[PDB]
């Protein structure tokens, strides 16, 4: 459907086998599906058609809010409260966006596991790798900031990580 | 149906419950016999169990001890 | 249950096979030319049939055929006797192959014991 | 003869097996009569107050009041610091605290050592 | 650990069941033993057999409990097999329903319990299992036959022991129809469910003949031994109970000690110390 | 209160207490819903010994059965494609160690 | 439960209670009726054998020995009547027992739903209120100055009187209230 | 039984909680069904509230 | 459920049991005859009679109350009073 | 926040100028209106708090507590009108004035944007509470209870005042936003250790921490019904709110100074549950249950993770509602029989059916029955503690088992069994009491329906 | 008549509501309702693309 992006929420093309009966007995599932279509599907479809027809008469729109980029805590001077506040708010919004990214990847993983069913171990290796990478990056960024997390604390953690990486690289090149 | 209580005597029974109990017991035994007639391998097995002592060293790939 | 447990526990574990270590001898040791087992169903076919990984043995093709026969003849759930028997026969053949492997391991172990005993006797003499 | 029954704290001695029930002194009968008289007086008071038509309320129980007072308010005034009380209080109020502190401190020290050594499986451990 | 827990549970609960005098207690211990058997089934890596046994046991154990309740209601809230008796002819339909349920529970060769219990026993015998767990499972099957024999023998066979005022009346359509609905399932549902589900595991086609008959042999052995021991009760011979009988009847002394000692210590610590 | 007489006409039949009689310090612990101290047909020491012996025997025999298991005279089961290397989640890029099963 | 207990049990009462308890537990052991009759006749034969004993000390010793034998040989799971204290149906209906003082708190509409019953209830209440003074006076007249030495209660010594302390005995909830 | 309607309501509530437990897809919902059947068992075992053994 | 008891039914059943007792002659048995004074029984016989009535009616009479039931009419009155029988 | 503060300061003249027979009606109606107005604060932002002005601000942590206070006031009014029928009009107006002042101080406390103003207001909450307890309590022990409560709280709080003024002198501001944006690490030294001790000990005494809790049984048992309702629902949450607010500047010293408090909280949670198992007084049982729940909240705050703060907030709200309901039920039974002994009145299930239903629901919510917000908060705290260490699961499991045991023990003892024979003054439950129970319980289930409203800023 | 009135309400109305909820609201966000992919056997016809999944190789038939 056009409600969601098929690229953001991937789904393999469905392959439903054609029915090839081998008995002269009737199909109770087929009969019950026909009865369900005649008793439930058509009434709910008519009701939804009327509701959508009512909706189309008073059509109106809502928008997606856009935020421009602002200087971050690295650019903010020491004890500059206005810039610090702006950077903290931007960092919090980006944190929420990253959380939703991790949620999207996790939902993709769950859906692929359920879809593949009995052979999920092999067929879902692609989605497990993406989740592994995303979770590793997210954990490295926001692992142990604490209850009173802040952009300053995350920046300090990144500085510590960069210092450790630089020391390791210098030791390797030595 | 109203069943009068008895004192120190066998209770009053009904032909309906008598025939229902007989019918369902006969149904159980008929089902058991009918199943044992058709698929008897569900109880007695279907495939023989090999006797490994009768397998030859030729087919088991065992060379002579001296060789 | 069985006599093999009694032989291994109340007897010579050296002459009885280890189920966890079997086989302990090369596959061609005693077989001049030995043929690899033939697999009929392919990996893609088994994956499409979504057989359980416990069920993807060398008897998987008969299981796939049985599943297809069962799905097609749905209301008549008694029309797959031949396919069920074929799958069971293949499983029986696999089990007797495993039994042959166990017996081969046992007699190879006792043959090795006899050979090493004879070599020890020759060294002693 | 038959094996004897050993009474315990949580499986007491049955009345029929009590040796004191087969050695009845004349003093014991007088004591039993006195106990029955006490019970009868209490029962008479309760039954009078219970069958009074004009009573509307709860019959106060002095025994219940004494029980609830002794269980709650009369404990501290009768407490004297003795060696037994001091040892029991120290044990039951300090030992568990230090025991759990030791357990959790050792666990967290091992966890931190593993984290520093970088050989602890922390993958997928996003929520904390 | 699951296999060992299930084995000890089924053995202990069956052993406690074979000597209870309350029919509801006997059925409850039978339920516990069947749960232990299901836990054994899970422990040998046979999860689907456990679910199949869940369904079959639901059917026939529900019917058995309904028959027990009918007996209790007919005999004026009497739950003692020592006071029941003569109900084979006093109550025909509940009698035949209980006999069918007991046969299904013990693994009658083609009833509802056959398509789960027999496969469970074969899987236990044919797998890489704990020897003690396997032995306890077999003994628990025998004791299952034993306590089913006890229920039937002391509830339906013999002479009446209930009070003289006979208020027996099982002609209610509600009771009859409910037991009928749960009775057709206790005979035919196993076959239908077994033949309709797809194969969830590889079958055990090849096995020794004696190992194929292990469930039936132990079931018949338990039936015969329990029947002989129960028939010995008619003799005019009175003997004091044994240590094993006291242990089995009193639930292994587990409720006594474990319900009096730990609770006493915890409650005493609650007030004396805290 | 479980030990107390059930047939007596107590003022509090469920609690089995009379009005005005002294209340035990541990009444809240000795109610019929709580710890019971009534005599048993078997001695407490005998019950404890039997229960502990039974559970210890079961644990010991479970350990013995674990070290002496029960199996069948068969070899390991054989699976086609390198013991199902790819189906169990093997790395497609990395080449597995080949596993070959022969006829017998 | 309807009889006021005495200060002690006599030797005859002790031995009779032991006899009944032993017979009950033997019946628990001997499930079948003919076997129970046989062994109960043997038990009564034992009691008859010890029935005549001039030495009360020896009689008490025999009673103690019999009590020990019973405690050893008792059935671990004896038969108990369903309504009896150990029974499966004991105290099942205690939640359905509601008293008349709860009854008199009803709304006027609820009372009006049952016109004839409450007239008789008011007659009973008038009878209760017109007799309490006589009951308490009779109780305090007959009791010794020291106090009641037993839980027994006197009957109505007069033609126009009711037995003292009767209201709750008479108006106790029915055995199967609902 | 004076409260057979309440008894049937309790049976239906137990059935609902058991269905929740069986059909639950995540651990929190499975725990919801778990505790629901537990509390319904508590309510139905002590059906006769005047019975100390039932409590 | 069960039919209610009546005074006549209780009396008939207790007399039935007592006439099936073999130490009592049914001809000289009436609802007012005493077990000890005019029937010639003793304490053990009275205990057996009380146990028989307990079996007959399916409820237990406590030992403190059973010792005082010295007459068939007393047994009838006690059972009716306990079972709430008034007609 | 003035749109909520001023209506209470107008409730005061309304109470003092209303007619003698309309005081309760007016106070209840306008308290409900103020609660409806204060429901607007639940519309929180996802990035920062609601800064109304330089003095008052609202947050995702402050909003649910304010709504709880505004909703709790009318329930206290109903209970007070129940138990104060014979008082004179002037004393009724004084009692209502005390309740109004307490609500006003609580609102200003939860909305104060500066630490010193927060301290002033959360200390000001003592005076109306002390007056209510020591004036309208029933027993002789109300005086001793008030003394214990007042002196415990003040001995805790005075070093907090010294610490706050010292922090102001050192850093330049006590504004919460400033101390959060300008927070600096706390070095390991004796001076910083004692500053940490001052702040945390003040709030632990307010919590209360195990070993500092005796004032809670003393005050809760001996206070009137309204005092007991406000002491457990809101006044206990001042410590948790303060600890959540104050721990911004105490890091990383909290990682090392939390061990004694964590051990005390866990073991005392176990001990107070065990005490609840063997309590002869119903109010004492409820008070010790409150102690256990607040000890769990203390554990969550001390371990100090984003998952613990959410569970802590949810548990605070749920415990407030549940404790208020339990205290109300106990007060109704006390008004029936004029005694607090738990075993005095039994068979209330067969004497008062709907009240037994209210008891059952309250007991079910007291133990963590899913999907109630009690369970949500407790489970979040348990999971955070499991991440902290893997024996906290042992302690939490023991606590949960004992919690279920004592909750159902209270329910069975009070409701099940057979009624007391001689207690014949148990009139049918009043419409007012049933409405009070319904208003206690329904918001709990609605919050279960919508859980994110009480999970705090960390959500 | 009672059976018909019961069946229409208790079964028909809830199934209408549930089908409307699932078809137009639940199946409007991704991954809300996920069906396990159908099993495909050799010698089959994939309906979406008109594909023919081929048969397996010859079996080494035994008896
Ligand atoms: C620390 C130990 C840990 C042990 C762990 C392992 C435990 C395993 C236990 C297994 C079960 C044991 C038997 C039941 C015990 C309870 C008996 C009881 O209470 O009965 C009363 C109860 C009836 O009581 P009641 O009607 O209320 O009346 C009261 C009695 O009158 C009252 O009369 P009573 O008191 O005289 O009756 C009891 C008395 C008589 O009852 C019995 O003997 C019943 C059991 C008879 C059958 C079991 C033995 C033979 C089984 C195999 C036979 C065939 C073998 C194969 C042959 C062919 C091979 C090719 O029992 C005994 O004397 C003991 C026998 C059992 C011993 C168990 C193991 C040792 C326990 C500890 C040591 C002390 C033992 C001595 C006793 C205490 C000291 C004095 O009996 C029954 O209901 C029937 C019980 C037996 C039915 C089932 C029989 C078959 C199933 C068990 C055997 C396994 C068969 C399959 C094997 C498969 C292998 C692959
Ligand atoms: C005369 C007899 C008096 C008896 C008084 C007994 C009081 C007992 C209750 C209070 C103390 C509880 C201690 C619990 C045991 C664990 C202690 C612990 O974790 O120590 C190590 C902890 C942590 O130290 P650490 O060992 O983890 O540090 C190692 C880490 N590095 C390397 C970075 C240093 O020590 C402290 O926390 C020291 C400061 C404690 C300040 C005082 C407050 C304690 C709590 C007071 C509660 C008051 C109310 C209750 C009492 C009334
Ligand atoms: C023993 C446990 C504590 C007993 C409490 C007894 C109450 C009175 C104690 C008097 C204070 C004890 C010393 C406290 C440490 C102190 O005063 O200074 C702390 C520090 C040092 O400041 P500087 O002068 O700048 O240092 C020099 C830097 N170049 O300043 C601060 O942090 C101010 C904080 C005030 C805390 C003082 C009291 C806190 C200690 C009490 C523990 C918590 C209260 C417990 C309540 C129980 C009451 C007994
Ligand atoms: C029924 C389950 C199968 C039982 C199989 C019994 C096999 C024989 C046996 O247990 O022998 C005793 C064995 C000593 O044999 P061994 O292997 O030498 O052990 C020395 C330990 N290093 O000793 C052991 O293995 C120790 C435990 C013996 C338990 C025997 C049973 C009681
Ligand atoms: P009535 O008032 O006539 O009653 C006559 C009595 C018995 C009161 C006599 O007047 C009397 O007191 N006689 C002397 C005292 C006496 O008889 N003492 C001995 C009696 S006890 C006794 O002999 C019991 C022995 C056998 C029964 C023992 C029970 C043990 C078996 C139980 C096993 C448990 C399961 C079966």
Q: Any idea of the CA torsion for J17, J21, J23, J24, to the nearest 10 degrees?
A: 180
User: Cα F85–F90–F92 angle (5° rounding)?
Assistant: 105
Sequence-distant (6+) residues with CB within 8 A of E249 are E16, E19, E20, E241, G76, G77
Backbone angles phi, psi at E94, to 5 degrees: -65, -35
Among I25, I38, I42, I55, the active-site one is I42
Cα–Cα distance for residue pair G152/J257, rounded to 1 Å: 71
Q: Which candidate, J159, E78, A100, F58, places its Cα nearest to that of G81?
A: E78
Neighbour subunits, H (≥3 Cβ pairs < 8 A) = F, G, J
C-beta separation of H32 from J368 below 8 A: no
The structure tokens listed for G118 are 């409450």
Q: Which helix (H) or strand (E) holds J262?
A: helix J259-277
What pairing do the DSSP bridges indicate for beta strands K44-46 and K51-53?
antiparallel
User: E232-260: string of b/e by CB count within 10 Å (b at 16+)?
Assistant: eeeeeeeeebeeeebbbbbbbbeebbeeb
How far is J421 from J415, CA to CA, in rounded Å? 15
What is the DSSP secondary-structure string of B7-67? ESSPPP--HHHHHHHHHHHHHHHHHHHHHHHH-THHHH-SSPPP-GGG--HHHHT---S--
Tally of residues, chain D: 128
Cis peptide before I71 (omega within 30 of 0): no
CB F15 within 8 A of CB F1: yes
Q: Which of A148, A150, A155, A160 to mutate to test the interface with J (most CBs of J within 10 A)?
A: A148
3-class DSSP assignment, residue J56:
strand
Question: Cβ neighbours of residue G147 under 8 Å, at least 6 residues apart?
Answer: D37, D40, D41, D44
DSSP for E47-89, written as a single string: HHHHHHHHHHHHHHHHHHHHHHHHHHHHTTS--BTTT---HHH
- Both tokens of G59, joined, read 């009689």
Rounded (10°) CA dihedral J316, J320, J326, J327? 130
CA atoms within 13 A on the CB side of F33: 23
Instruction: Count helices and strands (H / E) in chain E.
Output: 13, 1
D105, containing H or E segment: helix D83-117
Q: How far apart are the first and last CA of chain G?
A: 23
Closest ligand to the CA of J253 = 2
Residue J114's DSSP bridge partners are J175
* J201 contacts J163 by C-beta, under 8 angstroms: no
Give B15-18 contacts, CB < 8 A, sequence gap 24+: B16/E171, B17/E92, B17/E93, B17/E170, B17/E171, B17/E176, B18/E92
Method: cryo-EM
- Closest ligand to Cα G70: 5
| Closest by CA position to J91, among listed J8, J11, J16 | J16
CB J304 within 8 A of CB J247: yes
The pair of structure tokens assigned to A111 is 């859906």
CA distance J301 to J388: 12
Cβ <8 Å between J47 and A81? no
The number of beta carbons lying within 10 Å of the beta carbon of residue A28 is 10
Q: How close, in Å, is residue J395 to chain D by CA atoms?
A: 10
For residue J281, how many other CB atoms are within 10 A of its CB?
19
In whole angstroms, what is the distance from residue H18 CA to residue H10 CA?
12
Interatomic CA distance for residues C99 and C102, integer angstroms: 5
> Could you tell me if H21 and H36 are in contact, meaning their C-beta atoms sit under 8 angstroms apart?
yes
**Cα Dmax for chain E:** 65
Q: Which atom from ligand 4 is nearest to the alpha carbon of F65?
A: 2
Q: How far apart are the first and last CA of chain B?
A: 91
G interface with D, Cβ–Cβ below 8 Å: 5-8, 18, 60-61, 63-64, 67-73, 128-129, 132, 135-136, 139, 143, 146-151, 165-168
Q: Which tokens sit at A92? A: 């919090």
Q: How far is K14 from chain A (nearest CA, A)?
A: 10
Closest ligand 2 atom, residue J212 Cα: 49
Q: Which residues pair with K51 in a beta bridge?
A: K46
**Cβ atoms within 10 Å of K33's Cβ, excluding its own:** 10
The residues, ordered by sequence, that sit 6+ positions from A81 with a Cβ below 8 Å of its Cβ are J178, J181, J182
- Judged by 3 or more CB pairs under 8 A, whether J touches E is yes
Question: Could you tell me which chain F residue has the CA closest to the CA of G2?
Answer: F9
Long-range pairs, H42-46, Cβ under 8 A, ≥24: H42/J408, H43/H10, H44/H10, H44/H11, H44/H14, H46/J412, H46/J416
Q: Mind giving me the DSSP string for C32-95?
A: SS-PBPP--S-HHHHHHHT--TTT-STTHHHHHHHHHHHHHS-S-TTS-HHHHHHHHHHHHHHH
Let me know: does A150 contact J249? Beta carbons within 8 Å: no
Q: Whose CA is nearest to atom 31 of ligand 2?
A: J256
Query: Quick one: how far is CA J297 from the chain centroid?
Result: 12
D25, HSE (Cβ side, Cα atoms, 13 Å):
4
Interface touch J370/H52, C-beta < 8 Å: no
Mutate to test the interface with K, among C46, C58, C59, C64 (most CBs of K within 10 A): C64
Active site annotation includes I42 = yes
Resolution (Å units)? 3.1
Residue with tokens 């069975």: J412
CB J416 within 8 A of CB H50: yes
Inter-residue contact A121 to F88 (CB < 8 Å) = yes
CA distance J328 to J344: 18
Q: What distances in angstroms separate CA G18 from CA G41, G68, G146, J419, one per listed residue?
A: 15, 11, 36, 35
C-beta separation of F100 from C27 below 8 A:
yes
Kindly report the number of other CB atoms within 10 A of residue J37's CB atom.
13
What are the backbone angles phi and psi of residue C52, rounded to the nearest 5°? Answer: -65, 145
Nearest Cα neighbor of E274 from J270, I61, J235, J161 is: J270
Chains near G with 3+ CB pairs less than 8 A apart are D, E, F, H, I, J
CB J329 within 8 A of CB J355: yes
Q: Across-strand partners of G68?
A: none
Coil, strand or helix at E165:
strand
Q: Closest Cα partner for J97 from J38, J17, J216, J1?
A: J17
The pairing of beta strand E165-166 with beta strand J50-51: unpaired
CA-nearest of J296, J226, J227 to J78 is: J226
How many other C-beta atoms are found inside a 10 Å radius of the C-beta of residue E93? 26
- Write the DSSP symbol of residue J237: H
C-beta separation of F90 from C47 below 8 A: no
Rounded CA gap, E75 and E87, in Å?
10
Which residue reads 């809502």 in tokens? A62
Contacts of F87 in chain A (CB under 8 A): 119, 121-122
Cα dist. D63→D69, D70, F24, I77, J425 in Å? Answer: 10, 11, 10, 38, 21
Separation in Å, CA of F41 to nearest CA in chain C: 41
- Contact residues on chain I for F7, CB-CB shorter than 8 A: 62-64
Cβ atoms within 10 Å, residue J27? 27
Token pair 């090369």 is found at: C26
């Amino acid at each position: 459907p056009d409600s969601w992006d098929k690229d953001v929420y991937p789904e393999p093309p469905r392959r439903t086998p054609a029915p090839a009966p081998q008995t002269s007995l009737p199909n109770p599932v087929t009969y019950l599906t026909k009865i369900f279509d005649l008793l439930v599907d058509r009434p709910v479809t008519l009701a939804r058609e009327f509701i959508e027809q009512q909706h189309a008469k008073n059509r109106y729109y809502y928008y997606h809010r856009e935020f421009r980029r602002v200087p971050d805590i690295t650019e903010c001077e020491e004890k500059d409260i206005l810039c610090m506040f702006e950077a903290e708010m931007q960092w919090r919004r980006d944190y929420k966006v990253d959380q939703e990214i991790v949620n999207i990847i996790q939902e993709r993983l769950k859906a692929c596991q359920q879809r593949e069913g009995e052979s999920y171990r092999q067929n879902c290796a692609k989605e497990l790798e993406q989740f592994t990478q995303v979770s590793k990056a997210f954990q490295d960024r926001y692992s142990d900031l604490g209850a009173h997390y802040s952009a300053r604390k995350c920046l300090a953690k990144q500085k510590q990580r960069m210092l450790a990486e630089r020391k390791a690289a210098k030791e390797a090149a030595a | 149906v109203h069943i009068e209580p008895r004192y120190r005597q066998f209770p009053q029974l009904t032909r309906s419950q008598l025939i229902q109990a007989e019918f369902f017991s006969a149904t159980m035994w008929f089902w058991i016999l009918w199943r044992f007639w058709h698929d008897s391998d569900a109880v007695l097995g279907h495939f023989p169990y090999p006797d490994p002592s009768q397998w030859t060293d030729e087919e088991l790939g065992i060379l002579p001890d001296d060789e | 249950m069985g006599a093999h447990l009694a032989r291994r526990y109340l007897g010579d574990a050296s002459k009885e096979p280890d189920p966890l270590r079997m086989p302990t001898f090369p596959p061609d040791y005693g077989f001049p030319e030995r043929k690899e087992r033939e697999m009929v169903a392919t990996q893609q076919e088994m994956n499409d049939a979504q057989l359980m990984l416990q069920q993807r043995d060398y008897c998987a093709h008969y299981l796939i055929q049985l599943l297809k026969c069962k799905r097609d003849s749905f209301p008549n759930f008694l029309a797959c006797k031949h396919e069920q028997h074929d799958w069971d026969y293949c499983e029986h053949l696999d089990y007797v192959k495993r039994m042959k492997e166990f017996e081969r391991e046992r007699r190879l172990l006792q043959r090795k014991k006899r050979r090493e005993q004879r070599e020890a006797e020759m060294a002693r003499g | 003869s038959f094996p004897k029954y050993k009474p315990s704290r949580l499986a007491t001695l049955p009345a029929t097996l009590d040796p004191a029930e087969y050695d009845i002194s004349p003093e014991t009968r007088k004591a039993q009569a006195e106990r029955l008289a006490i019970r009868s007086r209490l029962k008479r008071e309760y039954l009078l107050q219970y069958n009074d038509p004009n009573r509307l309320g709860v019959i106060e129980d002095p025994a219940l009041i004494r029980w609830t007072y002794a269980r709650s308010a009369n404990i501290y005034p009768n407490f004297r610091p003795t060696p037994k009380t001091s040892l029991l209080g120290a044990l039951f109020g300090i030992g568990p605290l230090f025991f759990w502190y030791y357990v959790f401190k050792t666990d967290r020290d091992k966890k931190e050592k593993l984290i520093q050594e970088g050989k602890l499986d922390q993958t997928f451990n996003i929520s904390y | 650990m699951t296999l060992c827990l299930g084995a000890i549970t089924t053995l202990f609960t069956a052993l406690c069941a074979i000597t209870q005098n309350d029919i509801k207690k006997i059925v409850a211990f039978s339920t516990s033993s069947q749960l232990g058997l299901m836990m054994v089934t899970i422990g040998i890596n046979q999860p689907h057999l456990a679910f199949l046994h869940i369904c079959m046991h639901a059917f026939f154990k529900a019917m058995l409990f309904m028959c027990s309740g009918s007996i209790i209601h007919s005999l004026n809230d009497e739950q003692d097999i020592r006071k029941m008796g003569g109900l084979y002819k006093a109550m025909p339909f509940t009698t035949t329903a209980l006999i069918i349920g007991s046969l299904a529970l013990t693994g009658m060769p083609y009833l509802t319990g056959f398509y789960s219990k027999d496969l469970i026993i074969e899987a236990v015998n044919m797998s890489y299992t704990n020897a003690w767990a396997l032995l306890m499972t077999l003994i628990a099957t025998s004791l299952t036959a034993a306590y089913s024999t006890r229920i039937i023998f002391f509830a339906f066979l013999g002479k009446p022991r209930f009070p003289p005022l006979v208020l027996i009346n099982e002609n209610n359509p509600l009771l009859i129809n409910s037991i009928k609905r749960l009775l057709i399932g206790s005979i035919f549902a196993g076959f239908i469910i077994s033949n309709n589900i797809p194969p969830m595991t590889v079958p055990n086609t090849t096995m020794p003949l004696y190992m194929k008959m292990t469930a039936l042999i132990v079931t018949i052995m338990g039936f015969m031994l329990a029947l002989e021991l129960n028939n010995t009760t008619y003799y005019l011979k009175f003997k004091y109970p044994s240590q094993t009988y006291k242990f089995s009847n009193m639930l292994g002394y587990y409720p006594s000690i474990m319900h009096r000692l730990p609770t006493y210590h915890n409650l005493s610590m609650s007030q004396k110390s805290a | 209160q479980q030990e107390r007489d059930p047939w007596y006409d107590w003022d509090h039949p469920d609690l089995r207490l009379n009005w005005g009689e002294p209340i035990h310090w541990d009444l809240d612990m000795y109610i019929r819903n709580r710890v019971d101290t009534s005599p048993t047909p078997v001695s407490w020491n005998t019950m404890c010994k039997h229960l502990f012996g039974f559970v210890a025997f079961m644990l010991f025999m479970f350990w013995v059965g674990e070290i002496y298991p029960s199996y069948q005279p068969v070899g390991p089961k054989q699976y086609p494609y390198n013991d199902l290397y790819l189906e169990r989640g093997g790395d497609p890029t990395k080449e597995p160690e080949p596993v070959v099963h022969y006829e017998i | 439960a309807f009889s006021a207990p005495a200060a002690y049990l006599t030797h005859q009462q002790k031995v009779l209670r032991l006899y009944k308890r032993a017979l009950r537990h033997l019946e628990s052991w001997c499930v079948h009726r003919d076997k129970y009759r046989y062994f109960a006749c043997l038990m009564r034969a034992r009691f008859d054998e010890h029935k005549n004993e001039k030495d009360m000390v020896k009689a008490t010793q025999l009673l103690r020995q019999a009590e020990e034998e019973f405690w050893y040989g008792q059935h671990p799971q004896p038969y108990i009547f369903p309504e009896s204290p150990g029974g499966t149906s004991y105290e099942r209906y205690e939640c359905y027992k509601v008293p008349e003082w709860c009854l008199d708190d009803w709304h006027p509409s609820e009372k009006a739903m049952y016109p004839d019953y409450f007239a008789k209830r008011e007659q009973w209440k008038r009878l209760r209120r017109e007799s309490w003074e006589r009951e308490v006076k009779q109780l305090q007249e007959e009791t010794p100055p020291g106090g009641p030495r037993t839980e027994a209660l006197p009957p109505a010594r007069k033609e126009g009187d009711l037995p003292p302390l009767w209201w709750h005995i008479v108006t106790r909830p029915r055995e199967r209230p609902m | 039984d004076p409260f057979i309607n309440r008894f049937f309501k309790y049976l239906l509530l137990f059935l609902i909680t058991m269905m929740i437990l069986v059909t639950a897809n995540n651990l929190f919902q499975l725990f919801i069904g778990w505790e629901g059947v537990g509390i319904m068992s508590f309510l139905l075992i002590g059906w006769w509230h005047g019975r100390t053994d039932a409590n | 459920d069960a039919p209610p008891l009546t005074l006549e039914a209780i009396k008939d059943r207790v007399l039935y049991v007592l006439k099936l007792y073999d130490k009592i002659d049914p001809e000289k048995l009436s609802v007012n005859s005493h077990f000890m004074k005019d029937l010639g029984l003793d304490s053990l016989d009275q205990v057996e009679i009380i146990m028989a009535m307990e079996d007959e009616f399916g409820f237990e009479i406590p030992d403190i109350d059973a010792e005082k039931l010295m007459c068939p009419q007393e047994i009838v009155d006690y059972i009716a009073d306990k079972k709430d029988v008034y007609e | 926040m003035l749109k909520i503060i001023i209506p209470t300061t107008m409730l005061l003249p309304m109470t003092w100028m209303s007619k003698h027979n309309m005081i309760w009606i007016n106070a209840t109606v306008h308290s409900l209106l103020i609660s409806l107005i204060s429901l607007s604060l639940l519309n929180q932002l996802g990035e920062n708090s609601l800064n109304f002005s330089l003095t008052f601000f609202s947050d995702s942590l402050s909003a649910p507590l304010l709504v709880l206070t505004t909703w709790l006031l009318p329930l206290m009014l109903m209970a007070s009108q129940s138990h104060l029928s014979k008082e004179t009009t002037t004393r009724k107006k004084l009692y209502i004035t005390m309740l109004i002042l307490l609500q006003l101080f609580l609102i200003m406390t939860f909305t104060a944007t500066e630490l010193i103003l927060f301290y002033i207001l959360f200390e000001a909450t003592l005076v109306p509470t002390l007056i209510i307890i020591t004036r309208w309590g029933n027993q002789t022990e109300r005086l001793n209870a008030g003394l214990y409560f007042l002196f415990y709280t003040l001995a805790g709080s005075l070093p907090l005042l010294v610490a706050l003024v010292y922090i102001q002198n050192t850093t330049g501001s006590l504004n919460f936003l400033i101390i959060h944006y300008w927070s600096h690490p706390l070095s390991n030294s004796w001076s910083n250790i004692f500053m940490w001790l001052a702040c945390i000990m003040a709030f632990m005494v307010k919590m209360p921490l195990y070993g500092l809790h005796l004032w809670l049984p003393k005050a809760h048992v001996e206070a009137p019904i309204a005092g007991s309702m406000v002491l457990a629902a809101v006044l206990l949450k001042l410590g948790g709110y303060g600890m959540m607010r104050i721990t911004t500047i105490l890091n990383p010293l909290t990682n090392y100074m939390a061990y004694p408090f964590l051990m005390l909280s866990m073991w005392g949670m176990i001990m107070t549950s065990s005490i609840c198992l063997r309590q002869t007084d119903l109010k004492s049982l409820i008070a010790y249950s409150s102690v256990s729940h607040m000890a769990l909240v203390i554990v969550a705050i001390m371990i100090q993770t984003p998952w613990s703060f959410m569970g802590a907030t949810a548990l605070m709200i749920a415990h407030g509602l549940t404790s208020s309901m339990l205290f109300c039920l106990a007060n109704t039974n006390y008004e029936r029989v004029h005694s607090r002994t738990m075993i005095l009145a039994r068979g209330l299930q067969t004497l008062l059916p709907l009240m037994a239903t209210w008891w059952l629901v309250a007991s079910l919510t007291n133990l963590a029955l899913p999907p109630s917000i009690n369970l949500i908060g407790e489970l979040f705290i348990i999971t955070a503690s499991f991440s902290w260490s893997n024996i906290t699961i042992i302690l939490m499991g023991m606590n949960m088992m004992i919690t279920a045991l004592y909750s159902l023990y209270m329910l069975i003892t009070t409701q099940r069994g057979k009624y007391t024979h001689h207690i014949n003054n148990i009139k049918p439950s009043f419409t007012r009491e049933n409405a009070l129970m319904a208003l206690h319980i329904l918001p709990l289930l609605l919050l279960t329906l919508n859980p994110k409203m009480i999970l705090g800023p960390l959500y | 008549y009672r059976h018909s009135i019961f069946a229409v309400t208790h079964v028909l109305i809830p199934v209408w509501i549930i089908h409307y909820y699932l078809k137009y609201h639940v199946t409007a966000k991704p991954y809300t309702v996920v069906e396990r992919k159908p099993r495909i056997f050799p010698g089959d016809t994939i309906l979406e693309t008109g594909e023919v999944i081929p048969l397996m190789k010859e079996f080494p038939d035994q008896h």
